[PDB]
Amino acid sequence: SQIRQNYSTEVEAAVNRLVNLYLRASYTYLSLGFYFDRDDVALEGVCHFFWELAWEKWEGAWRLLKMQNQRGGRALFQDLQKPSQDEWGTTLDAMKAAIVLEKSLNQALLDLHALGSAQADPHLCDFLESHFLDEEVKLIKKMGDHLTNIQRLVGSQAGLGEYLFERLTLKHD
Amino acid sequence: SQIRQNYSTEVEAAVNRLVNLYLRASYTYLSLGFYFDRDDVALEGVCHFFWELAWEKWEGAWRLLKMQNQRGGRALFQDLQKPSQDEWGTTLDAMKAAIVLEKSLNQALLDLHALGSAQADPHLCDFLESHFLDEEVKLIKKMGDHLTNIQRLVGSQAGLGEYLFERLTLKHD
Amino acid sequence: SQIRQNYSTEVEAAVNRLVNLYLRASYTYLSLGFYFDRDDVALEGVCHFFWELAWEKWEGAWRLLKMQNQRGGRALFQDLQKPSQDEWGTTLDAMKAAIVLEKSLNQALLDLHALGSAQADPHLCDFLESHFLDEEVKLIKKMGDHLTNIQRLVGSQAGLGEYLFERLTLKHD
Amino acid sequence: SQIRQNYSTEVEAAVNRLVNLYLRASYTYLSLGFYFDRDDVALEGVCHFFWELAWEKWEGAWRLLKMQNQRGGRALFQDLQKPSQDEWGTTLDAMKAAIVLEKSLNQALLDLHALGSAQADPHLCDFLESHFLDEEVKLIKKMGDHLTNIQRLVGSQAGLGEYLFERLTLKHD
Ligand SMILES: [Cl-]
Ligand SMILES: [Cl-]
Ligand SMILES: [Cl-]
Ligand SMILES: [Cl-]
């Protein structure tokens, strides 16, 4: 490569693996959003929350691929596994699955940052810090906030709580 | 007729029958809206939902009659039966009655489309596809969404749920 | 299902298969665009052409999934295979691969339309006609136009022709 | 020094050396731009590309000197060697010389970042990451893109290709 400089094969491969994880996550969120759009589920704010994340994770994959080419590495795509479930249960089940997913993406980001630091690759480390690490902390905190509000609304009237959360916390129209 | 071309007597008669079904449906929705406007029912958003449908079905009848004349057929009006009930129960009872009504209109549209296809009447088939079939699918999906949200709000506090649905899902002011 | 009407299991399954084909096509176009963004390929207009198609096919999948729920069918996601190549050759090779891909999507659309017609499902047939069939004919014609212009530019100076096509036909900035 | 804190003599000296390298690079780009402004070379877009880089590297030197004073180190200027050539050959020769120059600046940035990390100087490390490392990766990728387009335009008509690149890729007016 005419441009490649200080860009390890190990980082290049790890970035391709992270692209796969982000595209998997995008696909998971597409499925989550369409489940909440079912006529027998019908939680518009929950659907929009997950569709926005489907877009956000697709965009994250695109930013990683752009950076891979900026560094002179080679994008290599692998098959994308389907999401872990076909039906996602309640809003609570779905938000628990989402925070498990985000903690897995966050650990992959942290592992790649540690590899970049071991390889003395400061551009990689800055790239993750600037575009991914804080967005992940902010999203995980938001999902934690939502889990707490969903949990306080269960009481002995789960349907009422699930409606109210969707109506009064999540964005709809 | 100086204009009539490729317009069967069978289609002409079926369009007149469909006009009757749409005017019946308009009348049903007028009754539903006035029931929810009673001082002892008093669900403004439910009343407005059904009054909008009373208008929409009157408009559908007018569009069918306009098309009948565009094709050179003859509008023939029949008596309009009163709605099936004088009192419509809860919002849930009313939305169940509405989706039964809309599935009956949808089946009549589908039957007329099948007659038009058998008669090789593409203008009729396009007319229904362009003005009626998707509006019916979209409305039935919306009513299904509403039925699911109404059902989740019943719990053991039916009055509370019925208020909240009207306040937080249906349009009022 | 509380809403499902005139929606066959055969159509429901075929729509899920078509979603998979559109998401595969989106993924193919993501790969095509990133190949042309390589520092050793560097054809900005070619990259933008394929990235726009990656978005367009993702959007097509979303519209099919929205329609599946509008009809009361159930979205079912399957694994997504990786694209057929890791490296896409010249602009000519890539545009030939794209028109093969689009003819495969077009045949799948035509097969689903024929199934809908056999099942007397006019909403399905109108949906494909209104959102997919003309967009596919227009795109395939555009790709044919581009293939002809690329082919006339090869001459005995392939590099010069490939540059000029990207500069003077495809959109860049 | 009344302000100096956590700022090693090693970093201070390395920053002064990097200032010299940036001012050398600015001077190289001044020479490159004036060569392409010759009446017997006459490639306006090539001249403007290199004059913009002459400004950019002067600005980089100024930012390093500002940071040196912010940290309480002392700017020390050394003689500036003349550029490596008086005549720069073709656009291809010149862009090859430019990417060699930029990889040398990038390695100096990476070496200073590694020194800062060894000295536990996070302000220095953040400063380079925020103002220099990504600007260098982006510029080197751009030069790689340009080298690929210049190389594809050589064919057996080098003059024609050199004109077309300057006219259709580089900014002029
Ligand atoms: Cl799997
Ligand atoms: Cl009666
Ligand atoms: Cl495969
Ligand atoms: Cl010298």
Side-chain angles (χ1 to χ4, degrees), chain A residues 1-95 97-155 158-170 172, chain B residues 1-95 97-155 158-170 172, chain C residues 1-95 97-155 158-170 172, chain D residues 1-95 97-155 158-170 172:
Chain A
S1 169
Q2 81 198 152
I3 70 173
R4 192 175 184 149
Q5 188 174 208
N6 196 216
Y7 194 60
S8 69
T9 60
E10 291 84 2
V11 164
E12 175 183 24
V15 165
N16 284 327
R17 286 199 293 274
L18 190 60
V19 166
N20 196 89
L21 293 177
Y22 268 72
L23 294 173
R24 282 177 54 191
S26 180
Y27 200 16
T28 296
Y29 286 129
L30 182 70
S31 177
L32 273 159
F34 278 105
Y35 169 79
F36 284 99
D37 178 68
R38 288 175 46 173
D39 73 273
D40 62 352
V41 177
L43 291 166
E44 183 177 322
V46 184
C47 161
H48 290 179
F49 178 85
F50 292 130
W51 284 335
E52 167 67 20
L53 287 177
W55 167 78
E56 288 187 11
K57 293 313 185 191
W58 166 279
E59 291 281 269
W62 188 99
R63 300 182 74 92
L64 287 157
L65 288 163
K66 184 82 186 175
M67 178 274 291
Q68 176 88 107
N69 273 353
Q70 280 167 331
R71 293 298 303 273
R74 289 302 176 248
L76 284 181
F77 296 98
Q78 304 296 344
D79 295 332
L80 293 168
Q81 72 196 85
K82 73 183 192 181
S84 65
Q85 308 172 209
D86 297 327
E87 294 188 307
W88 299 96
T90 61
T91 304
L92 177 55
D93 295 318
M95 194 67 67
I99 208 181
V100 169
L101 177 52
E102 290 304 325
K103 284 195 210 151
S104 80
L105 293 182
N106 197 214
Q107 191 59 238
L109 288 167
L110 292 174
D111 292 348
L112 178 54
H113 191 283
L115 175 61
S117 180
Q119 293 284 339
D121 192 337
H123 182 273
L124 180 278
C125 289
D126 166 84
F127 172 83
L128 293 180
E129 291 159 10
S130 295
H131 300 300
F132 290 88
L133 295 190
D134 190 50
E135 307 290 77
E136 198 56 39
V137 158
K138 279 176 170 51
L139 178 56
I140 295 167
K141 170 60 162 68
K142 179 60 69 176
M143 288 178 174
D145 292 352
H146 285 342
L147 283 168
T148 294
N149 279 281
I150 294 160
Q151 284 164 338
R152 72 169 38 91
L153 279 161
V154 175
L160 170 63
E162 189 163 24
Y163 179 76
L164 288 169
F165 182 75
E166 181 272 334
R167 288 288 86 185
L168 298 180
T169 295
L170 302 176
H172 51 83
Chain B
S1 169
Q2 81 198 152
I3 70 173
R4 192 175 184 149
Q5 188 174 208
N6 196 216
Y7 194 60
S8 69
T9 60
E10 291 84 2
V11 164
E12 175 183 24
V15 165
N16 284 327
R17 286 199 293 274
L18 190 60
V19 166
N20 196 89
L21 293 177
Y22 268 72
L23 294 173
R24 282 177 54 191
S26 180
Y27 200 16
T28 296
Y29 286 129
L30 182 70
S31 177
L32 273 159
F34 278 105
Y35 169 79
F36 284 99
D37 178 68
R38 288 175 46 173
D39 73 273
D40 62 352
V41 177
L43 291 166
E44 183 177 322
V46 184
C47 161
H48 290 179
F49 178 85
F50 292 130
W51 284 335
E52 167 67 20
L53 287 177
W55 167 78
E56 288 187 11
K57 293 313 185 191
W58 166 279
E59 291 281 269
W62 188 99
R63 300 182 74 92
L64 287 157
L65 288 163
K66 184 82 186 175
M67 178 274 291
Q68 176 88 107
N69 273 353
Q70 280 167 331
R71 293 298 303 273
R74 289 302 176 248
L76 284 181
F77 296 98
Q78 304 296 344
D79 295 332
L80 293 168
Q81 72 196 85
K82 73 183 192 181
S84 65
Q85 308 172 209
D86 297 327
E87 294 188 307
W88 299 96
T90 61
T91 304
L92 177 55
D93 295 318
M95 194 67 67
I99 208 181
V100 169
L101 177 52
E102 290 304 325
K103 284 195 210 151
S104 80
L105 293 182
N106 197 214
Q107 191 59 238
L109 288 167
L110 292 174
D111 292 348
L112 178 54
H113 191 283
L115 175 61
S117 180
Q119 293 284 339
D121 192 337
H123 182 273
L124 180 278
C125 289
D126 166 84
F127 172 83
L128 293 180
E129 291 159 10
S130 295
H131 300 300
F132 290 88
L133 295 190
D134 190 50
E135 307 290 77
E136 198 56 39
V137 158
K138 279 176 170 51
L139 178 56
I140 295 167
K141 170 60 162 68
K142 179 60 69 176
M143 288 178 174
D145 292 352
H146 285 342
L147 283 168
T148 294
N149 279 281
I150 294 160
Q151 284 164 338
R152 72 169 38 91
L153 279 161
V154 175
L160 170 63
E162 189 163 24
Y163 179 76
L164 288 169
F165 182 75
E166 181 272 334
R167 288 288 86 185
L168 298 180
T169 295
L170 302 176
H172 51 83
Chain C
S1 169
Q2 81 198 152
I3 70 173
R4 192 175 184 149
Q5 188 174 208
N6 196 216
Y7 194 60
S8 69
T9 60
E10 291 84 2
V11 164
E12 175 183 24
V15 165
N16 284 327
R17 286 199 293 274
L18 190 60
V19 166
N20 196 89
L21 293 177
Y22 268 72
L23 294 173
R24 282 177 54 191
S26 180
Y27 200 16
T28 296
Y29 286 129
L30 182 70
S31 177
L32 273 159
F34 278 105
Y35 169 79
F36 284 99
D37 178 68
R38 288 175 46 173
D39 73 273
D40 62 352
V41 177
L43 291 166
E44 183 177 322
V46 184
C47 161
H48 290 179
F49 178 85
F50 292 130
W51 284 335
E52 167 67 20
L53 287 177
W55 167 78
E56 288 187 11
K57 293 313 185 191
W58 166 279
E59 291 281 269
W62 188 99
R63 300 182 74 92
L64 287 157
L65 288 163
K66 184 82 186 175
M67 178 274 291
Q68 176 88 107
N69 273 353
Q70 280 167 331
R71 293 298 303 273
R74 289 302 176 248
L76 284 181
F77 296 98
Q78 304 296 344
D79 295 332
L80 293 168
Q81 72 196 85
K82 73 183 192 181
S84 65
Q85 308 172 209
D86 297 327
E87 294 188 307
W88 299 96
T90 61
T91 304
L92 177 55
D93 295 318
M95 194 67 67
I99 208 181
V100 169
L101 177 52
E102 290 304 325
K103 284 195 210 151
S104 80
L105 293 182
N106 197 214
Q107 191 59 238
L109 288 167
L110 292 174
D111 292 348
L112 178 54
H113 191 283
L115 175 61
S117 180
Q119 293 284 339
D121 192 337
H123 182 273
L124 180 278
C125 289
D126 166 84
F127 172 83
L128 293 180
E129 291 159 10
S130 295
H131 300 300
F132 290 88
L133 295 190
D134 190 50
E135 307 290 77
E136 198 56 39
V137 158
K138 279 176 170 51
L139 178 56
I140 295 167
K141 170 60 162 68
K142 179 60 69 176
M143 288 178 174
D145 292 352
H146 285 342
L147 283 168
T148 294
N149 279 281
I150 294 160
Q151 284 164 338
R152 72 169 38 91
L153 279 161
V154 175
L160 170 63
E162 189 163 24
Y163 179 76
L164 288 169
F165 182 75
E166 181 272 334
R167 288 288 86 185
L168 298 180
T169 295
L170 302 176
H172 51 83
Chain D
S1 169
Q2 81 198 152
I3 70 173
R4 192 175 184 149
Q5 188 174 208
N6 196 216
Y7 194 60
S8 69
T9 60
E10 291 84 2
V11 164
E12 175 183 24
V15 165
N16 284 327
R17 286 199 293 274
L18 190 60
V19 166
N20 196 89
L21 293 177
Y22 268 72
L23 294 173
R24 282 177 54 191
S26 180
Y27 200 16
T28 296
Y29 286 129
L30 182 70
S31 177
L32 273 159
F34 278 105
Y35 169 79
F36 284 99
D37 178 68
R38 288 175 46 173
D39 73 273
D40 62 352
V41 177
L43 291 166
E44 183 177 322
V46 184
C47 161
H48 290 179
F49 178 85
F50 292 130
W51 284 335
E52 167 67 20
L53 287 177
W55 167 78
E56 288 187 11
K57 293 313 185 191
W58 166 279
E59 291 281 269
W62 188 99
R63 300 182 74 92
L64 287 157
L65 288 163
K66 184 82 186 175
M67 178 274 291
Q68 176 88 107
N69 273 353
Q70 280 167 331
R71 293 298 303 273
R74 289 302 176 248
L76 284 181
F77 296 98
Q78 304 296 344
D79 295 332
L80 293 168
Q81 72 196 85
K82 73 183 192 181
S84 65
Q85 308 172 209
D86 297 327
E87 294 188 307
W88 299 96
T90 61
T91 304
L92 177 55
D93 295 318
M95 194 67 67
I99 208 181
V100 169
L101 177 52
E102 290 304 325
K103 284 195 210 151
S104 80
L105 293 182
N106 197 214
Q107 191 59 238
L109 288 167
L110 292 174
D111 292 348
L112 178 54
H113 191 283
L115 175 61
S117 180
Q119 293 284 339
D121 192 337
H123 182 273
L124 180 278
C125 289
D126 166 84
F127 172 83
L128 293 180
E129 291 159 10
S130 295
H131 300 300
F132 290 88
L133 295 190
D134 190 50
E135 307 290 77
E136 198 56 39
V137 158
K138 279 176 170 51
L139 178 56
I140 295 167
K141 170 60 162 68
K142 179 60 69 176
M143 288 178 174
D145 292 352
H146 285 342
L147 283 168
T148 294
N149 279 281
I150 294 160
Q151 284 164 338
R152 72 169 38 91
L153 279 161
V154 175
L160 170 63
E162 189 163 24
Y163 179 76
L164 288 169
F165 182 75
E166 181 272 334
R167 288 288 86 185
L168 298 180
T169 295
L170 302 176
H172 51 83

